[PDB]
Design a protein around this ligand. Sequence first.
Ligand SMILES: *[C@@H]1O[C@H](CO)[C@@H](O)[C@H](O)[C@H]1NC(C)=O
Ligand SMILES: *[C@@H]1O[C@H](CO)[C@@H](O)[C@H](O)[C@H]1NC(C)=O
Ligand SMILES: *[C@@H]1O[C@H](CO)[C@@H](O)[C@H](O)[C@H]1NC(C)=O
Ligand SMILES: *[C@@H]1O[C@H](CO)[C@@H](O)[C@H](O)[C@H]1NC(C)=O
Ligand SMILES: *[C@@H]1O[C@H](CO)[C@@H](O)[C@H](O)[C@H]1NC(C)=O
Ligand SMILES: *[C@@H]1O[C@H](CO)[C@@H](O)[C@H](O)[C@H]1NC(C)=O
Lengths: 49, 240, 299, 50
Amino acid sequence: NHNAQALNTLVKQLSSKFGAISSVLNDILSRLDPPEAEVQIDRLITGRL
Amino acid sequence: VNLITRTQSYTNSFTRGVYYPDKVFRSSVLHSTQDLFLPFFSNVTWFHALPFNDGVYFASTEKSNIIRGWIFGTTLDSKTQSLLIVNNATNVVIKVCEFQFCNDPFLDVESEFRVYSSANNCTFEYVSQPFLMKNLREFVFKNIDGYFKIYSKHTPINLERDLPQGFSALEPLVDLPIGINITRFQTLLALHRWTAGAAAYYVGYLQPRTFLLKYNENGTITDAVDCALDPLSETKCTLK
Amino acid sequence: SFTVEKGIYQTSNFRVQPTESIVRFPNITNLCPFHEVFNATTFASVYAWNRKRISNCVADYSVIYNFAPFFAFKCYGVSPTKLNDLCFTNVYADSFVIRGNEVSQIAPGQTGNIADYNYKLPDDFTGCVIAWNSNKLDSKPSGNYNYLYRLFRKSKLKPFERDISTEIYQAGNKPCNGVAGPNCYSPLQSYGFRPTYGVGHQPYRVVVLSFELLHAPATVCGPKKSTNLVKNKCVNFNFNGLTGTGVLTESNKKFLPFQQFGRDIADTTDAVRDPQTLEILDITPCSFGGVSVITPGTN
Amino acid sequence: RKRISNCVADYSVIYNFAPFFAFKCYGVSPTKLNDLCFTNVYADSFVIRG
Ligand SMILES: *[C@@H]1O[C@H](CO)[C@@H](O)[C@H](O)[C@H]1NC(C)=O
Ligand SMILES: *[C@@H]1O[C@H](CO)[C@@H](O)[C@H](O)[C@H]1NC(C)=O
Ligand SMILES: *[C@@H]1O[C@H](CO)[C@@H](O)[C@H](O)[C@H]1NC(C)=O
Ligand SMILES: *[C@@H]1O[C@H](CO)[C@@H](O)[C@H](O)[C@H]1NC(C)=O
Ligand SMILES: *[C@@H]1O[C@H](CO)[C@@H](O)[C@H](O)[C@H]1NC(C)=O
Ligand SMILES: *[C@@H]1O[C@H](CO)[C@@H](O)[C@H](O)[C@H]1NC(C)=O
């Protein structure tokens, strides 16, 4: 039970926004431009860390 | 032209008024949704210029086809736009025109002069196959961020006086980008022409609540839990 | 290290690359009425700003580039370069005429008389603003007073709010009762445009495009033609703006006639509906894993 | 430079004085000013090019 619960929580955490425009990297890579996407990508990287 | 008699009563909603929140398929899962719903075991009005508030649950059980059409507006005058829905034996027509409505609008049967004086300036018009097809018909109307949403369901019922006990999910029917305010609404009847008649229907109101929905293996909702009815429901929602 | 002991070591990972790309789109053919909203020879005032809704058409931006060498072109939600491939549900178009010096006043988080009394944008705005000079169309030699601007309002306006009230603003409790003068002034002033006027005062046609994301299945996009369909192969797919990669197989799921997507316990996409031909397809991720190296000692 | 203190601070005169061309508040928003409390206020006045 504990192993399954921990894995489920870890995989569920991937859908959070952490104060970004979107929780999908492809959406940001298809909508925005290189020199501005970093501000959004940093929050996702941190939260997943 | 006034031929309407309305008597009010009150009854229990039980567990009616559950609809699919969105168009995403799910199966064999339990989901949690925060949206406008009709609370379980509610005080619903029975009727033999009602406010709109924040959504309306409407129910009827008459097979006479005496019920047809609806009017939605803010001031119910020709100075402001008003949704008008008409259903007849062939099609359904939706208009957003600023009609000069009357005190008791109803179908003459089929002149609409008693309904309104004349049509006026307007842009949106919709024509589709009719909504209407021992039986119970349930509808849910809401209006959020410029979109008017309608859900409907038709079920076969046995001989009963009040609403039956059970679950029947309501499926989306249409969605219109109107973007106007609605504060009051009215119901249209079709009396032959001037024989007096009577009709009954149930009305309830929606509130923002959190629900727990259960999907079966084929993707249909078969059970729901209101997360604020009583402590046992709170425990169920916490434990998922 | 230059020496390795006996054992098994975990080095790097491996995965399988997609073979090709798959693009799908509906069979619509009607072109969007972007031409009509422009070059109409008639533009509304700033306080009474026109609103139009565009949907259910093929959105092509070539007319935007060939229409005029725009003086101002600022996109906020997305970059202007990647606009010919995105998909949207509804588009909102606003057009009006403003003074050349007020163009920068129209942006989210900005002030100005247009901003607070005429028209303001939400902080989370997602769209573009286009402005081109119109000195040779709406600048009479004697002057044109058709366009007016508000100057006084009790408070700040709201995002996406249109004001059409025409009342004499009262600067206090001094009664005026419809007259103009003491503590009672008309807040609307007419533009003055002449060809002799230089840059900074000549009229400018301004059009604001506003998009909305993730509200319904996409309806306005598709300038790129669709391709064929393949199965049982690692491939990229783009279903009406939904982009992904993996393997597509036949599905036995019983989709309801109004839902299109599919999800699982972990909230991931595991099914899709082909737009052109109504069919259900299961999506599975392509193979990936770790690579281990088994070695005896280098000695 | 002037110092204002020990008085009832009413901002009605601010609104009725003139339709100000520029009104920019940084530390706090201009809307919530009739309820705050302060120790001393410093007022500076001058004339500048537009
Ligand atoms: C429902 O409303 C009526 C009148 O509004 C009230 O008398 C009654 O107590 C309420 N509750 C029930 C359970 O009927
Ligand atoms: C129902 O209303 C539509 C819309 O006016 C009309 O075209 C149609 O003929 C009507 N049906 C009948 C049976 O009159
Ligand atoms: C309808 O609205 C338009 C647009 O403002 C207006 O010109 C017209 O006078 C209104 N009334 C009618 C009957 O068209
Ligand atoms: C709609 O009508 C109501 C009631 O008259 C009013 O309060 C509101 O400002 C109007 N407009 C909108 C957008 O709700
Ligand atoms: C689901 O569908 C299958 C076949 O489509 C059927 O055998 C089964 O009874 C259904 N389950 C329900 C309706 O709960
Ligand atoms: C737009 O209209 C003007 C005159 O109304 C015309 O000269 C022009 O060719 C039209 N098309 C474009 C793309 O400007």
